[PDB]
Amino acid sequence: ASGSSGTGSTGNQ
Amino acid sequence: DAKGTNVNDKVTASDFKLEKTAFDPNQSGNTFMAANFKVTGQVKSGDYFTAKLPDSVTGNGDVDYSNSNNTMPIADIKSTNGDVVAKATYDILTKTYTFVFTDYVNDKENINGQFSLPLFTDRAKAPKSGTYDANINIADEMFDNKITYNYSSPIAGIDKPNGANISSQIIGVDTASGQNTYKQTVFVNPKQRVLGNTWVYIKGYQDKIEESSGKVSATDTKLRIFEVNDTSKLSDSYYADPNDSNLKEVTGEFKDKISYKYDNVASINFGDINKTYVVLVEGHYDNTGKNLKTQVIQENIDPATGKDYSIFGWNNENVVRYGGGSADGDS
Ligand SMILES: [Mg+2]
Ligand SMILES: [Mg+2]
């Protein structure tokens, strides 16, 4: 994959 | 059962480790904190202990909880049999995790366990690449760390003096509330080149409409557009504060220049420009359960010659990380 990508957490839901 | 007494004074955390101390949040980089903990003596249901994060890190990362009262559930701390030992939540505003013991603990003693929780950059408080202190409190004890963010630069595009250049990042996605909002920052002309007949396209998908949940439209999308005074002052992290004096909102100058005529895309007519602009996108995604994937595109010419066309695209998608923990005590 190209561009940029983010990341986070949904707290296991 | 309800959150009761703070028992940080009975809980000691130990063997603290970050999974890694350097990463790139613009390529989905993150870390984890891992620690053991043990209770001296007995606790009861409703007793709780906490962990507190500093300015440089967050527990939520690019997932946004502003529509869910700034609170996020965290994985349960479970015993071997699978019984819940503590339920956990995290406050986005105060960066505090709270672990509340369940009645599992009432007949136990010397409960001990461990957890691994994902930690992310704070794009607002750590806006530039560099090393930051990341001193973390667990149960009234400090565990000092340094974390290095090597952000992939947002300053990207075609390699000509009049080349199209644009980048973006989705920095908030609401997965919890049901509203399905997302927040995206777009940097238009971050090279600050002189561009002719500039057009920008913000898509709710990449190459295949059916493969993204994004919905860009007059009813689902609001755009705010800011002229940047000093490009050097823009974040590496893609955070951009609409109230920062470096940004001058010019949204009212684009009322005839924004079109939602085409499917799942908004076009913006920038014309002849020589500055960088920030576009703050407040959007929505559908309930198909598909990944949210987007692409922004900019095309332009060389204004002095009318030719030397170019076009540049920039894709975004985000990934989710999870935590886990366990604990048991003797009867
Ligand atoms: Mg303590
Ligand atoms: Mg449309």
Residue numbers in the entry:
A (entry chain Q): 9 to 21
B (entry chain A): 209 to 539
Copy text from the publication.
ClfB, an MSCRAMM (Microbial Surface Components Recognizing Adhesive Matrix Molecules) family surface protein, described as a fibrinogen-binding clumping factor, is a key determinant of S. aureus nasal colonization, but the molecular basis for ClfB-ligand recognition remains unknown. ClfB plays a key role in establishing human nasal colonization by binding to the human type I cytokeratin 10 (CK10) expressed on squamous epithelial cells. As a bifunctional MSCRAMM, ClfB also binds to fibrinogen α (Fg α), which is assumed to be significant in platelet activation and aggregation and has been shown to contribute to the pathogenesis of experimental endocarditis in rats. In this study, we solved the crystal structures of apo-ClfB and its complexes with fibrinogen α (Fg α) and cytokeratin 10 (CK10) peptides.
